[PDB]
Amino acid sequence: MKVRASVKPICKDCKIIKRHQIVRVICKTQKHKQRQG
Amino acid sequence: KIGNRTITLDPAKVNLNFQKDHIAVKGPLGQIELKLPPNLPLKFELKDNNLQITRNNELKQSKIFHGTYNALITNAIIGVTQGFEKKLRLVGVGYRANVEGETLNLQLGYSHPIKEKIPKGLTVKVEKNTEITISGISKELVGQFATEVRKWRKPEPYKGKGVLYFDEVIVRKAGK
Amino acid sequence: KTSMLTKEQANKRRQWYIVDAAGLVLGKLAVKAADLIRGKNKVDFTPNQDCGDYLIIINSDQVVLTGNKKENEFWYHHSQYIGGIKKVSGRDMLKKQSDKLVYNAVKGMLPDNRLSRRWITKVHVFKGDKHNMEAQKPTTLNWS
Amino acid sequence: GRGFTGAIKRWNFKIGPLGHGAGYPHRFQGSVQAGRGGASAQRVFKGKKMSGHYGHEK
RNA sequence: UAAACGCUGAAAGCAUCUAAGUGUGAAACUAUCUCAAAGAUUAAUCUUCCCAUUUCGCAAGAAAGUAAGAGCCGUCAAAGA
RNA sequence: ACCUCGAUGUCGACUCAUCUCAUCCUCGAGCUGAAGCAGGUUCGAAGGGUUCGGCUGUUCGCCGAUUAAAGAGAUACGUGAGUUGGGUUCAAACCGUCGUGAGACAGGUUGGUCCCUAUCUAUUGUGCCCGUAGGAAGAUUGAAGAGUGUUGCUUCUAGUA
RNA sequence: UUCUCGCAGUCAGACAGUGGGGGAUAAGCUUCAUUGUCAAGAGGGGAAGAGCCCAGAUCAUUAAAUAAGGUCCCCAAAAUA
């Protein structure tokens, strides 16, 4: 999703997943999705 | 947990057969062919009315499989004894569904009607023009088929219109 | 001064063998294959002549590899044209050309040599099992 | 068979103005220079559109 | 197949497109459209024709060098400096 | 302050373009302060293409019109042993200034000479000898690659959602 | 490595390390002092490399111990846990 250099817990529902060696964050909001940790 | 959890067996019709690297299960719902990797890190000691699994060594792959295989066997048992069922709700005034044989056809926001084929081993029941009931013996296939159905139409946040996975709550948006 | 070290003088002869590659990895099989082709393992090695032996490979389509290099590793080859680079993966070679893959893999460890040019062609690579070379009565062996 | 054709016709190229006295040569392959020196191109590359025998092609 | 969207599914009893398994999906890529071709020395394959004119040499035709074909020369063109 | 100044010729204009992506459009996906439409947003993404005219010697740059767009770099500020020198940087002359004076202006102003019979490699076509294993003639597999992979408008579905 | 005598030669050094300055503890840059090298002296390691490491070559050896360094193959050179 979002291009960054790190990932942060945006809210209390921001789980951290590692799909295909790619670390992303999943949360309630579709704007709460980031990438590139 | 899961590796420490053991599940009983009800072999009224269900019986187990050890293949070279697979498992053959027979029960009320067809025959189940459990595909497992060769040289299994886990060992599934099956007794009367009980099954217990354990790994011969400690490996991260083996540690993962300690729960993975147990969950997979439990899901296979519950599927063969009861099946996996899911309801899809197609909400929309012009969004209508019906099924003829294996060919399910939809009238949607697209002017082009969309046709899809029912996969083998899964049964589709069109109880209502806005309701679909998928009933299989494997959760993987029914989930994948539900995704194949929903990829054509998905609910919208401004106004619920699309294929809900049995009418979940969605984020409400607005605009005039 | 000198001891006049003497070696073979055109007394060479190459012996045909049969090998199957199904479980060996590419590099550690190819090194010994090259050593057998050049006759390195023999004691009467002569570079002024040839001292290797013939070799025929059977069912090269079943060669396996460690890790995900079948899908992770890629091999490049450039032809002198725009876009002449061809990039291949391990699984593609198992699908299109494994015999050529192993052939060039063995050729890559060969020295830059006029005889190695005439040595790489001495191996007969087949992804099957039947060929006219069986009439030569090869000495079937393994671990090459 | 068109025999010894021209690159202007073999490749169907375009020639600019002939006014203002722009020298005698007007039908040539254009600039064959891509790079010079032992750092950028140093040569003519393979696969270059050039004239020759035209026709007699199945 | 990339990104991306996934199902089951653990570590993490929830959940998870990934870890095993199971998919979809890009004007890019391997093909299918066209060119071309074994000096592809990696020298390949198939078919067809010719004949072994008694008889030698450091290994066999010194000597009759084809019954097959090609070449030299001319007419030329759908060719073609 | 360097291999090069017993010599690596340039600014630009025309021709040849190529490659790459930090993609402009065409391809795809996701989020929205994305009702629709028109979007913004981040990425994968290099196959193709991305205008014309006026002025400036001017590349550039400004303006007008047009498409979906009029993307960005590199290749000696690519490209004369492919063309031109318009400017530029020979003397020649004037204007304004400076030096008193020869003169100078990183000012303008006018014109003001671009050499080549191709040795080799690469590179595009076509032949000669040999190979392809008795000689000759056809037909091939395909080893290897190469060309090619642009795209707009109108109508219907439908003024429908 | 003292003095005298005769003949000189060189000042356009560079590199690597240390301590620096300037530059920006940018520059294979400049300025310095010091420690070594090439210049003026080759060789092995370093993928090929003047200044790095090991090292200082009368000549012939188809003799041995080695240094740096290296031991899957190209390419001599090992294995066990």
XYZ file of C-alpha atoms (C1' of nucleotides) in Angstrom:
738
model
C 0.000 0.000 0.000
C 1.595 3.223 1.224
C 5.278 3.725 0.437
C 7.252 4.486 3.607
C 10.470 3.490 5.341
C 8.910 2.246 8.613
C 5.538 1.176 10.042
C 3.695 2.404 13.126
C 0.525 1.340 14.960
C -1.952 3.932 13.694
C -4.677 2.763 16.101
C -5.421 -0.112 18.470
C -6.488 -2.447 15.614
C -3.322 -2.153 13.481
C -2.116 -5.733 13.241
C 1.244 -6.389 11.568
C 1.355 -9.122 8.917
C 4.182 -10.543 6.782
C 2.823 -11.663 3.409
C 5.429 -13.107 1.013
C 8.286 -11.618 3.063
C 6.560 -8.208 2.775
C 5.621 -6.535 6.054
C 2.322 -4.634 5.973
C -0.275 -3.410 8.476
C -3.998 -4.217 8.479
C -6.532 -2.170 10.449
C -10.201 -1.201 10.438
C -9.768 1.793 8.130
C -8.834 1.311 4.486
C -6.684 4.437 4.914
C -4.944 2.638 7.812
C -3.126 0.281 5.409
C 0.591 0.918 4.913
C 3.648 -0.883 3.528
C 7.436 -0.660 3.165
C 8.519 -0.935 6.782
C -3.457 -25.092 22.464
C -3.750 -27.123 19.249
C -0.829 -29.543 19.379
C -1.818 -30.269 22.981
C -5.490 -30.602 21.944
C -6.755 -34.023 20.858
C -10.004 -34.652 18.988
C -12.211 -37.718 19.317
C -13.398 -39.886 16.424
C -16.889 -41.082 15.456
C -16.220 -43.913 12.965
C -19.829 -44.800 12.188
C -18.923 -44.509 8.499
C -15.607 -42.635 8.661
C -12.487 -44.745 8.239
C -8.856 -43.769 7.702
C -6.285 -45.127 5.252
C -2.561 -44.316 5.237
C -1.294 -43.519 1.742
C 2.353 -43.014 0.764
C 2.147 -39.307 1.650
C -1.625 -38.674 1.710
C -4.626 -39.620 3.846
C -7.782 -41.333 2.569
C -10.885 -40.570 4.646
C -14.295 -42.113 4.057
C -17.445 -40.706 5.613
C -21.010 -39.528 5.011
C -19.862 -36.842 2.530
C -17.902 -38.578 -0.230
C -14.225 -39.470 0.000
C -11.735 -36.930 1.347
C -8.179 -37.004 -0.020
C -5.929 -35.155 2.437
C -2.824 -33.989 0.555
C 0.111 -33.766 2.973
C 3.828 -33.282 2.287
C 5.954 -36.418 1.907
C 8.092 -37.491 4.858
C 5.659 -35.974 7.319
C 7.276 -34.238 10.325
C 4.152 -35.138 12.305
C 2.921 -38.586 13.343
C -0.836 -39.126 13.699
C -1.420 -42.038 16.089
C -5.090 -42.903 15.602
C -6.846 -45.129 18.133
C -10.498 -45.975 18.771
C -12.521 -42.770 19.247
C -9.341 -40.671 19.496
C -6.424 -39.294 17.484
C -3.193 -37.829 18.865
C -0.424 -36.136 16.890
C 3.214 -35.534 17.790
C 6.408 -34.454 16.038
C 9.469 -36.705 16.121
C 11.816 -33.687 16.255
C 11.830 -29.945 16.999
C 11.863 -27.782 13.867
C 10.189 -24.450 13.137
C 8.436 -26.075 10.183
C 7.607 -29.025 12.444
C 6.497 -26.670 15.229
C 4.163 -24.887 12.796
C 2.848 -28.192 11.454
C 2.125 -29.297 15.040
C -0.872 -26.964 14.916
C -1.390 -26.781 11.159
C -1.905 -30.519 10.629
C -4.148 -30.854 13.688
C -6.346 -27.995 12.485
C -6.428 -29.425 8.953
C -7.510 -32.879 10.155
C -10.143 -31.343 12.439
C -11.496 -29.270 9.546
C -11.527 -32.347 7.304
C -13.523 -34.260 9.925
C -16.055 -31.481 10.473
C -16.405 -31.027 6.704
C -16.974 -34.703 5.967
C -19.472 -34.998 8.822
C -21.296 -31.700 8.186
C -19.948 -29.846 5.131
C -19.022 -26.198 4.728
C -21.828 -23.771 3.939
C -21.861 -20.064 3.163
C -24.567 -17.545 2.286
C -24.047 -14.692 -0.169
C -26.514 -11.800 -0.314
C -26.661 -9.861 -3.589
C -28.126 -6.449 -2.725
C -29.204 -4.194 -5.584
C -32.407 -3.230 -7.387
C -31.040 -4.259 -10.785
C -28.666 -6.857 -9.365
C -30.381 -10.222 -9.845
C -29.080 -13.794 -9.795
C -30.205 -17.185 -11.048
C -28.687 -20.582 -11.854
C -29.355 -23.100 -14.629
C -27.419 -26.319 -14.162
C -23.815 -25.423 -13.421
C -24.184 -22.078 -15.235
C -24.962 -19.282 -12.794
C -25.890 -16.016 -14.509
C -26.178 -12.511 -13.093
C -27.698 -9.237 -14.254
C -25.607 -6.452 -12.754
C -24.664 -2.798 -13.131
C -22.866 -3.874 -16.294
C -25.192 -4.126 -19.282
C -23.457 -7.446 -19.993
C -24.793 -10.365 -17.914
C -22.082 -12.399 -16.223
C -21.934 -16.197 -16.358
C -19.869 -18.511 -14.168
C -19.535 -22.268 -13.738
C -20.159 -24.155 -10.496
C -17.010 -26.085 -9.474
C -17.062 -29.839 -9.009
C -17.838 -30.980 -5.473
C -19.750 -27.820 -4.513
C -23.524 -27.394 -4.628
C -25.124 -24.013 -5.287
C -28.717 -23.337 -4.227
C -30.459 -20.181 -5.468
C -33.142 -20.035 -2.784
C -34.001 -16.458 -3.791
C -32.966 -14.243 -6.689
C -30.926 -12.170 -4.194
C -29.572 -15.091 -2.130
C -27.007 -17.801 -2.907
C -26.162 -20.813 -0.714
C -22.876 -22.604 -1.374
C -22.495 -26.035 0.257
C -19.326 -28.076 -0.191
C -17.209 -30.531 1.796
C -14.033 -28.420 1.658
C -13.756 -24.904 3.072
C -10.925 -23.966 0.693
C -12.907 -24.602 -2.495
C -16.082 -22.917 -1.239
C -14.107 -19.871 -0.097
C -12.326 -19.617 -3.440
C -15.621 -19.991 -5.331
C -17.185 -17.296 -3.139
C -14.268 -15.018 -4.033
C -14.796 -15.829 -7.720
C -18.458 -14.853 -7.340
C -17.739 -11.664 -5.386
C -14.973 -10.377 -7.685
C -17.666 -9.364 -10.181
C -19.633 -7.265 -7.666
C -18.603 -5.967 -4.237
C -20.476 -3.788 -1.717
C -19.967 -0.031 -1.788
C -19.491 2.243 1.238
C -21.754 5.034 -0.040
C -24.672 2.605 -0.411
C -24.640 -1.146 0.159
C -24.867 -2.765 -3.274
C -23.019 -5.959 -4.121
C -22.283 -9.409 -2.733
C -22.197 -9.456 1.059
C -20.779 -12.567 2.743
C -24.143 -13.065 4.475
C -24.912 -9.427 5.290
C -21.998 -8.065 7.321
C -21.807 -4.461 8.534
C -19.939 -2.045 6.259
C -18.634 1.498 6.633
C -21.333 4.027 5.726
C -20.453 6.895 3.385
C -22.649 9.578 1.861
C -22.924 11.965 -1.063
C -25.618 13.775 -3.043
C 68.917 -30.574 -14.754
C 65.970 -32.456 -16.257
C 64.491 -35.916 -15.744
C 62.646 -35.963 -19.112
C 59.120 -36.408 -17.804
C 57.316 -38.549 -20.383
C 53.574 -39.048 -20.881
C 51.243 -40.687 -23.383
C 51.823 -39.980 -27.085
C 48.619 -40.301 -29.157
C 47.818 -43.561 -27.317
C 44.494 -42.085 -26.169
C 41.015 -43.612 -26.281
C 37.709 -42.431 -24.821
C 35.338 -44.852 -23.084
C 31.564 -44.378 -23.190
C 29.505 -44.346 -19.987
C 25.849 -43.964 -18.979
C 24.735 -41.776 -16.068
C 21.331 -40.737 -14.739
C 20.806 -37.396 -12.982
C 17.675 -37.277 -10.823
C 18.803 -36.331 -7.324
C 22.191 -34.669 -7.695
C 22.573 -30.896 -7.705
C 23.943 -29.104 -10.754
C 27.296 -27.857 -9.477
C 28.560 -30.809 -7.443
C 27.584 -33.254 -10.207
C 28.974 -31.066 -12.994
C 32.388 -30.678 -11.347
C 32.931 -34.446 -11.297
C 31.425 -34.723 -14.784
C 33.999 -32.224 -16.065
C 36.796 -34.039 -14.233
C 35.766 -37.296 -15.923
C 35.463 -35.656 -19.358
C 38.934 -34.107 -19.129
C 40.423 -37.245 -17.603
C 41.544 -35.252 -14.563
C 40.779 -38.145 -12.202
C 43.173 -40.399 -14.157
C 46.880 -40.660 -13.360
C 48.185 -40.470 -16.950
C 46.828 -36.964 -17.543
C 48.376 -35.278 -20.565
C 47.317 -31.838 -21.846
C 49.467 -32.248 -24.950
C 47.026 -35.068 -25.798
C 43.529 -35.982 -24.608
C 42.985 -38.405 -21.742
C 39.253 -38.108 -21.035
C 36.423 -40.489 -21.811
C 33.032 -40.329 -23.488
C 29.900 -39.847 -21.405
C 26.155 -40.101 -22.000
C 23.579 -38.679 -19.591
C 20.124 -40.215 -19.161
C 16.987 -38.355 -18.048
C 18.477 -34.937 -17.338
C 14.970 -33.450 -16.992
C 14.742 -34.740 -13.394
C 17.701 -32.842 -11.909
C 16.778 -31.188 -8.613
C 18.187 -28.151 -6.810
C 18.344 -26.850 -3.253
C 16.166 -24.013 -2.036
C 13.994 -21.858 -4.270
C 16.764 -21.353 -6.854
C 14.485 -23.109 -9.346
C 12.288 -20.004 -9.061
C 14.739 -17.542 -7.475
C 17.952 -17.989 -9.467
C 18.079 -16.678 -13.025
C 20.627 -17.254 -15.783
C 21.499 -14.680 -18.433
C 22.772 -15.172 -21.964
C 23.455 -12.296 -24.359
C 23.083 -12.410 -28.116
C 24.513 -9.425 -29.961
C 21.148 -7.723 -30.527
C 18.896 -5.198 -28.821
C 17.130 -7.175 -26.125
C 19.493 -10.078 -26.785
C 19.622 -10.972 -23.091
C 17.615 -14.106 -22.382
C 16.836 -14.582 -18.683
C 15.798 -18.042 -17.497
C 14.826 -19.701 -14.230
C 15.379 -23.212 -12.934
C 11.795 -24.354 -13.454
C 11.770 -22.969 -17.004
C 14.794 -25.125 -17.826
C 12.919 -28.110 -16.397
C 10.122 -27.069 -18.772
C 12.075 -26.141 -21.925
C 15.759 -27.180 -21.900
C 17.442 -28.951 -18.997
C 19.926 -30.774 -21.241
C 21.221 -27.489 -22.645
C 21.247 -26.032 -19.126
C 23.479 -28.769 -17.705
C 25.581 -28.747 -20.886
C 26.412 -25.051 -20.516
C 26.806 -25.472 -16.745
C 29.560 -28.035 -17.333
C 31.003 -25.890 -20.130
C 31.242 -22.893 -17.788
C 33.838 -24.626 -15.586
C 35.883 -25.660 -18.616
C 39.144 -23.739 -19.139
C 39.522 -21.271 -21.979
C 41.219 -23.907 -24.105
C 41.172 -25.186 -27.683
C 40.871 -28.784 -26.443
C 38.076 -27.984 -23.975
C 36.302 -26.676 -27.074
C 36.680 -30.206 -28.475
C 36.001 -31.708 -25.015
C 32.602 -30.194 -24.178
C 31.084 -31.823 -27.271
C 32.254 -35.276 -26.119
C 29.251 -35.556 -23.767
C 25.895 -36.719 -25.138
C 23.092 -35.258 -23.021
C 19.561 -36.669 -23.268
C 16.494 -35.887 -21.165
C 15.168 -39.326 -22.161
C 16.664 -42.798 -21.951
C 16.978 -44.228 -25.497
C 19.505 -43.215 -28.156
C 21.663 -44.710 -30.893
C 24.712 -44.366 -28.631
C 23.582 -47.476 -26.729
C 24.933 -49.526 -29.648
C 28.441 -48.387 -28.653
C 28.172 -50.605 -25.540
C 28.899 -47.885 -22.937
C 30.202 -48.728 -19.467
C 27.247 -47.713 -17.314
C 28.235 -46.167 -13.982
C 27.089 -43.540 -11.478
C 28.385 -40.731 -9.243
C 29.932 -38.595 -11.971
C 13.534 -8.371 -57.105
C 14.474 -4.709 -56.668
C 18.230 -5.344 -56.808
C 20.539 -2.818 -55.179
C 18.049 -0.507 -53.471
C 18.558 2.576 -51.311
C 18.082 2.858 -47.561
C 15.766 5.791 -48.306
C 13.484 3.342 -50.143
C 14.380 0.087 -48.367
C 13.458 1.598 -44.988
C 11.184 4.381 -46.329
C 12.884 7.333 -44.647
C 12.494 11.086 -45.144
C 14.955 13.685 -46.440
C 14.874 17.239 -45.126
C 15.166 20.521 -47.010
C 17.381 20.936 -50.058
C 17.375 24.738 -49.952
C 19.898 27.189 -48.515
C 22.629 25.220 -50.293
C 22.818 22.305 -47.857
C 25.758 20.559 -49.495
C 25.849 17.946 -52.255
C 24.936 14.727 -50.332
C 21.241 14.297 -49.544
C 20.628 10.522 -49.796
C 22.546 8.858 -46.960
C 21.830 6.684 -43.918
C 21.825 9.663 -41.569
C 24.027 9.731 -38.498
C 25.729 6.409 -37.791
C 27.333 7.960 -34.694
C 25.873 6.770 -31.403
C 28.872 7.115 -29.097
C 32.609 7.501 -29.466
C 35.616 6.807 -27.296
C 36.186 3.630 -25.313
C 33.449 4.463 -22.803
C 29.974 4.836 -24.393
C 29.515 2.954 -27.665
C 32.856 2.951 -29.564
C 31.344 1.056 -32.533
C 28.419 0.449 -34.859
C 25.941 -1.920 -33.206
C 24.493 -5.120 -34.624
C 21.032 -4.858 -36.136
C 21.321 -1.555 -37.997
C 18.955 -0.556 -40.797
C 21.103 -0.383 -43.939
C 20.482 -0.809 -47.659
C 21.280 -3.800 -49.874
C 19.388 -6.257 -52.065
C 15.631 -5.672 -51.927
C 12.916 -8.171 -52.738
C 13.179 -11.905 -53.376
C 11.759 -12.616 -49.928
C 9.151 -15.291 -49.280
C 2.946 -13.841 -14.096
C 4.755 -8.372 -11.339
C 2.051 -5.123 -8.352
C -2.677 -6.335 -6.657
C -7.084 -9.278 -5.152
C -7.781 -14.515 -2.761
C -9.514 -19.532 -0.013
C -7.808 -23.032 3.860
C -4.426 -22.502 7.383
C -0.652 -22.414 11.799
C 3.378 -20.156 15.043
C -0.177 -16.517 17.560
C -6.411 -22.062 20.239
C -8.693 -15.533 17.515
C -7.171 -14.169 13.030
C -3.909 -14.347 8.783
C -3.128 -14.556 0.286
C 2.158 -18.087 2.793
C 4.729 -20.930 5.960
C 2.667 -26.515 3.261
C -1.474 -26.663 -0.282
C -5.014 -24.147 -3.497
C -6.100 -19.646 -7.319
C -7.259 -15.090 -10.102
C -4.859 -11.276 -12.323
C -0.391 -6.284 -16.442
C -0.120 -2.470 -23.063
C 5.763 -6.212 -19.885
C 7.650 -11.780 -20.616
C 7.451 -17.459 -23.203
C 4.249 -18.700 -27.729
C 0.566 -18.483 -31.271
C 1.148 -13.268 -36.673
C 5.952 -12.677 -40.222
C 11.537 -13.659 -41.604
C 14.948 -17.100 -41.483
C 17.858 -21.154 -41.038
C 22.529 -27.584 -39.185
C 29.610 -23.189 -40.378
C 23.389 -25.369 -35.119
C 31.784 -27.645 -36.089
C 25.699 -28.402 -31.588
C 28.537 -29.902 -38.306
C 21.595 -33.231 -37.472
C 17.511 -35.863 -39.910
C 14.520 -38.149 -44.232
C 14.082 -39.433 -49.174
C 16.114 -40.077 -54.167
C 19.983 -41.247 -57.980
C 25.182 -43.318 -59.534
C 28.170 -47.377 -59.701
C 31.622 -51.304 -57.469
C 34.916 -52.331 -65.890
C 40.329 -58.262 -64.942
C 43.596 -55.825 -62.222
C 49.032 -52.168 -58.061
C 51.965 -49.106 -55.136
C 54.275 -46.805 -47.736
C 47.441 -49.938 -47.086
C 44.705 -50.280 -52.793
C 42.742 -48.262 -57.645
C 49.644 -46.879 -60.586
C 46.115 -47.532 -64.916
C 39.768 -47.374 -68.250
C 38.323 -41.204 -63.487
C 30.004 -42.086 -64.335
C 25.647 -44.895 -66.447
C 24.478 -39.218 -62.148
C 25.314 -34.414 -62.177
C 27.804 -29.987 -62.469
C 31.070 -26.609 -64.712
C 33.296 -23.824 -69.384
C 30.281 -20.987 -73.812
C 25.730 -18.835 -75.914
C 20.245 -17.161 -75.739
C 18.147 -14.714 -72.254
C 14.386 -12.891 -67.500
C 10.148 -12.724 -62.880
C 16.700 -12.401 -62.114
C 20.333 -9.242 -62.420
C 26.933 -3.531 -60.182
C 44.730 20.657 -12.380
C 44.690 14.596 -14.508
C 46.048 9.961 -19.644
C 45.194 14.196 -23.822
C 47.398 20.107 -25.349
C 54.120 16.593 -32.342
C 45.445 18.555 -32.422
C 39.715 14.788 -28.045
C 36.699 20.424 -33.607
C 32.566 22.837 -31.004
C 26.647 26.099 -30.029
C 22.679 25.199 -32.959
C 19.793 23.753 -37.048
C 18.495 18.599 -40.684
C 19.192 13.006 -40.670
C 19.956 8.440 -37.581
C 18.188 6.932 -33.407
C 18.979 3.755 -29.161
C 18.563 2.481 -24.113
C 16.677 3.335 -19.125
C 12.647 4.845 -15.610
C 12.260 8.975 -11.136
C 5.411 6.629 -16.546
C 3.016 11.352 -19.858
C -0.940 8.519 -22.435
C -2.286 3.799 -23.758
C -2.156 -1.648 -19.479
C -3.526 -3.151 -14.248
C -4.369 -2.686 -9.123
C -5.454 -0.160 -4.227
C -7.117 4.358 -0.894
C -9.978 8.710 -0.614
C -12.310 14.855 2.271
C -13.774 8.733 -4.566
C -23.043 10.400 -5.075
C -22.080 9.928 -10.695
C -18.797 12.369 -14.302
C -14.418 14.616 -14.040
C -10.631 13.041 -10.329
C -6.341 13.332 -6.670
C -3.437 9.615 -4.579
C 0.744 5.019 -4.305
C 2.873 1.117 -6.925
C 3.866 -2.802 -10.688
C 4.619 -1.155 -15.131
C 9.576 0.653 -20.675
C 5.644 -2.654 -25.872
C 4.254 1.599 -28.956
C 3.637 6.644 -29.300
C 3.601 11.486 -27.339
C 2.095 17.768 -32.697
C 2.066 22.098 -35.692
C 2.951 27.394 -36.544
C 5.172 32.853 -35.099
C 9.701 35.171 -32.630
C 14.588 34.805 -30.934
C 21.457 32.521 -34.348
C 19.375 31.432 -29.817
C 19.256 24.727 -27.775
C 16.327 26.814 -24.493
C 12.373 30.008 -23.740
C 7.453 32.868 -24.698
C 2.532 32.741 -27.365
C -1.592 30.556 -30.237
C -4.055 26.223 -31.968
C -4.582 20.508 -31.465
C -4.703 15.208 -29.472
C -4.947 10.708 -24.618
C -0.561 12.809 -23.944
C 2.427 16.860 -26.478
C 7.098 12.880 -20.062
C 12.612 13.125 -18.292
C 17.617 11.833 -18.853
C 22.183 9.597 -21.096
C 25.048 8.369 -25.433
C 32.309 13.510 -26.242
C 26.360 19.848 -23.616
C 25.669 12.031 -29.144
C 25.682 12.633 -34.154
C 31.250 17.237 -40.440
C 36.887 10.859 -41.717
C 26.645 12.081 -42.579
C 25.186 18.573 -44.812
C 25.306 23.865 -43.200
C 27.939 27.404 -40.578
C 22.739 31.311 -38.691
C 25.166 32.726 -34.066
C 29.995 31.920 -32.191
C 35.757 33.078 -31.757
C 40.481 36.128 -38.042
C 41.343 40.790 -39.826
C 37.674 44.559 -42.185
C 33.474 49.135 -40.230
C 30.448 52.059 -37.294
C 27.531 53.347 -32.786
C 27.905 54.195 -26.902
C 31.662 53.924 -23.336
C 36.699 53.356 -21.662
C 42.476 54.182 -22.498
C 44.919 60.600 -24.493
C 47.796 56.344 -27.614
C 48.347 51.719 -30.338
C 43.468 49.445 -28.852
C 39.376 47.019 -25.724
C 34.273 45.986 -24.400
C 31.709 39.049 -20.516
C 28.025 45.436 -25.727
C 25.229 45.929 -30.408
C 25.864 46.298 -35.382
C 27.147 44.147 -41.658
C 29.179 40.316 -44.392
C 33.086 37.498 -43.526
C 36.222 29.554 -47.553
C 34.575 23.528 -43.395
C 40.002 18.952 -46.786
C 39.653 13.892 -48.122
C 40.577 8.142 -54.363
C 37.680 3.535 -47.339
C 43.606 0.306 -44.948
C 41.366 -2.746 -41.006
C 37.386 -3.979 -37.347
C 32.370 -3.447 -36.402
C 28.319 -3.027 -39.329
C 23.885 -4.063 -44.234
C 23.478 -7.071 -48.430
C 25.783 -10.764 -52.077
C 29.788 -14.303 -53.737
C 34.667 -17.575 -53.908
C 37.447 -22.430 -51.584
C 36.616 -26.019 -47.898
C 33.742 -28.436 -44.312
C 28.824 -30.890 -43.370
C 33.307 -37.865 -44.170
C 31.769 -42.376 -51.140
C 29.874 -38.595 -54.957
C 25.484 -36.066 -56.501
C 19.994 -33.906 -55.897
C 15.966 -32.471 -53.300
C 12.674 -31.990 -48.459
C 13.123 -30.985 -43.674
C 13.166 -30.768 -37.936
C 14.617 -26.606 -35.381
C 19.817 -24.746 -32.501
C 19.730 -19.749 -32.345
C 17.180 -15.403 -32.761
C 15.041 -11.153 -35.328
C 10.639 -8.014 -37.136
C 6.249 -7.080 -34.730
C 3.830 -5.974 -30.507
C 0.291 2.242 -32.121
C -4.488 3.754 -31.198
C -8.754 7.617 -31.586
C -13.909 8.766 -32.589
C -19.189 7.656 -33.233
C -23.547 4.502 -32.167
C -26.148 0.611 -29.256
C -26.887 -1.303 -24.645
C -28.768 3.886 -22.190
C -29.743 9.273 -20.291
C -29.373 3.149 -17.776
C -27.397 2.673 -13.042
C 77.033 7.686 9.306
C 84.839 11.271 10.756
C 87.851 14.724 7.669
C 90.200 15.900 3.027
C 90.464 15.017 -2.172
C 88.134 13.855 -7.546
C 83.664 13.080 -10.097
C 78.908 13.852 -9.417
C 73.591 13.521 -9.456
C 68.608 15.596 -7.675
C 64.645 19.910 -5.961
C 58.056 19.213 -10.991
C 57.718 13.597 -6.735
C 53.878 10.334 -6.099
C 51.359 6.514 -3.212
C 49.843 3.826 1.463
C 49.499 4.379 7.287
C 49.804 7.765 11.514
C 49.073 13.061 13.601
C 47.245 17.254 11.198
C 45.812 22.008 8.491
C 43.141 24.039 4.376
C 39.261 22.308 1.660
C 33.733 19.913 4.361
C 37.962 14.686 9.116
C 34.372 16.148 0.195
C 37.961 15.175 -3.586
C 42.761 9.450 -6.620
C 42.933 17.498 -3.946
C 46.641 20.860 -1.649
C 49.945 21.819 2.323
C 53.076 19.519 6.188
C 56.080 16.043 9.751
C 56.722 10.938 10.557
C 56.763 5.476 9.168
C 57.526 2.073 4.427
C 57.223 1.471 -1.253
C 58.128 2.805 -6.461
C 61.025 5.932 -8.376
C 66.400 3.752 -8.860
C 64.031 -3.296 -7.564
C 61.801 -7.809 -9.978
C 58.578 -11.781 -7.767
C 53.967 -14.301 -5.145
C 48.919 -12.853 -2.723
C 45.552 -8.993 -4.012
C 40.339 -10.931 -10.742
C 43.817 -8.795 -13.585
C 46.754 -3.377 -10.642
C 54.461 1.141 -8.935
C 53.672 2.509 -4.281
C 48.513 -2.427 -0.048
C 50.306 -7.507 2.312
C 54.361 -11.297 2.109
C 58.890 -10.184 0.520
C 64.912 -8.076 -1.716
C 66.060 -12.184 -7.557
C 74.522 -14.249 -9.318
C 73.077 -18.147 -13.007
C 71.005 -24.133 -13.865
C 67.863 -27.570 -11.531
C 61.882 -31.950 -13.955
C 65.320 -30.749 -5.583
C 63.309 -29.542 0.060
C 61.229 -26.100 4.075
C 58.176 -22.384 3.766
C 55.935 -16.423 4.140
C 51.696 -13.724 2.787
C 47.810 -16.092 1.079
C 44.747 -20.233 -0.438
C 42.353 -25.678 -0.766
C 34.168 -27.669 -5.088
C 35.762 -26.751 -10.438
C 38.097 -23.549 -13.765
C 43.360 -23.737 -10.918
C 48.278 -27.402 -7.901
C 46.170 -27.044 -2.867
C 41.294 -31.170 4.048
C 38.850 -32.819 6.633
C 36.257 -33.411 11.339
C 32.814 -31.601 15.116
